[PDB]
């Protein structure tokens, strides 16, 4: 498969994933958008070949409903209005992560056991996002007139008011950079002429007012006081029925992040403390620091006096937030003993992995701004220890604490035989985990009169393998639909009955092999998703 392994970035993932379960006419249009960036429909037509002008709009409105792109409008002063179209980074993640949304709902919601909506609450998650956008009136108008609809309608306020089912709007549906644009000149035109002094300080007036509003505008969907209707008749608490809503991945990604940390807990402590650490984290999953950090996504990230201010206040948010700082007296009742919950939590402060590290005496809280880089430094190293020899794990850690090491001191710090490390180190040059620093003894970079120094270079060393997995996420599901191209004469027959004896076997051998794919797709999905904590 050399045709694909060479000239394909992440676009090879995005093109085929909408080609997996959606029409083929829309796989080529967003392949044009991701390749060329941003463009209008009027000149979209000649970039592709074979789709008519109205036939784009039918195809684009087909792709609009699942929230997979984001449009943005600007007009010309002498001209009419024009509408650009971008690509949405996280909306296409939803049908990527679509299998794992189902298994988390059951695992987060353990208050019910053998309920009659085990089939239905897993269907509801498949009924809220498969058609796209969704409102309250659209599922009560089903075949079920009542069938205890008042239970099922009031089931959702338990399921929505914990989060991640926020009302949809234009705010998260328009891009963030262009959202940051048209609010910047508005506050810049709130200050007119005749405020003359410090013109290079007058740009901060709109800039400080932007940050106060930009947190408030993203809090408008997080504002949960406008999605309630306290009904004085026949009810006690219900959402507003005229509200269009879909999934919100923000809690899901934080919930997946808490799913990752407990695995690191079970490695560095035994079985008793791992059960302790999982319970306290579930209480604070619904409100946590943001994983995507939209404020650090775009803005004035250039200058260090502000680039340091994107984590000075963001750290100060984390410890000074009232909604997570637990007092270690609440935790004893939630487990299915004030001395033991001190004792099992005492060793979380002792370990050099900074989770439950720093606190005020009596209260406890886990940090994230100084933790997940140790998580990024954890999952990176052992994968190298798996894909080649554990000697390569030894050389990687020797360059960690000792920076810019030469070839004499590696035999002084570590100790293996001299001929075997070069047959291991050069494997790590090829994958861009170690680098080369050159020092010239003579003029004009003469290669013989030189020695060669190393480095870790902590930023390039992750960005290589993140695309080495994004392509590996993209490679194996090409063999999914290609496997469906052959043996296609009987899956059409197996979609027609709702029975030849010898043909039934070759429907099973194409069944357990694709059953291996989704398991092999899930395992490396967790090894990839840790590299999104930027």
């Amino acid at each position: 498969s050399l045709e694909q392994r060479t000239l394909n970035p992440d676009l090879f993932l995005y093109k085929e994933l909408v080609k997996a379960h959606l029409g083929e006419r829309a796989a080529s249009v967003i392949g044009m958008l991701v390749a060329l960036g941003r463009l209008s429909v009027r000149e979209l037509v000649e970039k592709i070949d074979g789709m008519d002008v109205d036939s784009v709009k039918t195809t684009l409105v087909s792709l609009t409903q699942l929230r997979c792109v984001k449009y943005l409008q600007e007009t010309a002063i002498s001209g009419k209005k024009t509408t650009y179209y971008y690509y949405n980074e996280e909306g296409i993640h939803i049908l990527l992560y679509s299998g794992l949304i189902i298994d988390e709902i059951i695992t987060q919601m353990r208050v019910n056991d053998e309920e009659e909506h085990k089939q239905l609450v897993a269907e509801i998650v498949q009924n809220v996002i498969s058609l796209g956008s969704l409102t309250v009136e659209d599922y009560l108008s089903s075949v079920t007139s009542d069938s205890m609809k008042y239970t099922i309608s009031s089931l959702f306020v338990q399921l929505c008011e914990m989060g991640y089912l926020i009302q949809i709007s234009k705010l998260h549906y328009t891009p963030i950079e262009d959202l940051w644009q048209f609010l910047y000149e508005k506050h810049y035109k709130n200050i007119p002429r005749n405020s003359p002094l410090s013109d290079l300080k007058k740009r901060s007036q709109a800039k400080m007012n932007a940050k106060t509003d930009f947190a408030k505008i993203i809090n408008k969907p997080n504002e949960l006081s406008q999605i309630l209707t306290v009904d004085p008749k026949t009810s006690l608490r219900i959402v507003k029925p005229t509200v269009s809503l879909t999934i919100n991945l923000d809690r899901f990604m934080k919930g997946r992040r808490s799913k990752q940390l407990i695995n690191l807990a079970k490695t560095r402590v035994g079985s008793v403390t791992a059960q302790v650490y999982k319970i306290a984290l579930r209480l604070t999953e619904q409100k946590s620091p943001k994983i995507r950090d939209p404020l650090t996504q775009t803005g004035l990230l250039q200058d260090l006096e502000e680039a340091k201010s994107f984590q000075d206040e963001a750290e100060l948010v984390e410890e000074k937030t009232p909604g997570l700082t637990f007092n270690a007296i609440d935790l004893a009742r939630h487990l299915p003993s004030a001395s033991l919950i001190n004792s099992h939590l005492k060793i979380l402060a002792s370990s050099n992995f900074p989770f439950l590290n720093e606190t005020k005496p009596g209260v406890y809280y886990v940090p994230y701004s100084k933790l997940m880089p140790v998580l990024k430094s954890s999952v990176y190293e052992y994968v190298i220890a798996s894909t080649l020899g554990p000697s390569a794990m030894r050389l990687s850690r020797c360059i960690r604490d000792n920076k810019l090491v030469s070839e004499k001191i590696i035999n002084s710090t570590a100790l293996m035989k001299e001929k075997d490390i070069r047959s291991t180190l050069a494997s790590l040059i090829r994958y861009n985990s170690v680098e080369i620093q050159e020092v010239p003894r003579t003029a004009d970079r003469s290669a013989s009169r030189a020695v060669f120094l190393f480095r870790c270079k902590e930023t390039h060393s992750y960005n290589f393998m993140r695309q080495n997995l994004e392509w590996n996420m993209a490679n194996l599901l090409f063999k999914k639909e290609k496997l469906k191209q052959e043996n296609s004469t009987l899956l059409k027959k197996a979609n027609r009955d709702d029975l030849l004896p010898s043909e039934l076997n070759q429907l099973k051998m194409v069944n357990e092999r694709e059953l291996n794919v989704f398991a092999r797709l899930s395992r490396l999905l967790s090894l990839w998703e840790v590299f999104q904590m930027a």
Partner: protein, 35 residues
């Protein structure tokens, strides 16, 4: 022709073979839908 696989090549467990059911019927939901 290429060596050194990833360490995740294992028999599927009953913890996630029910999770693999939820993929294929999700694709049958949407593709047999409107689009």
């Amino acid at each position: 022709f290429p060596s050194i696989p990833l360490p995740i090549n294992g028999p599927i467990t009953n913890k996630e073979r029910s999770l693999a059911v939820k993929y294929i019927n999700f694709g049958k939901t949407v593709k047999d839908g409107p689009f």
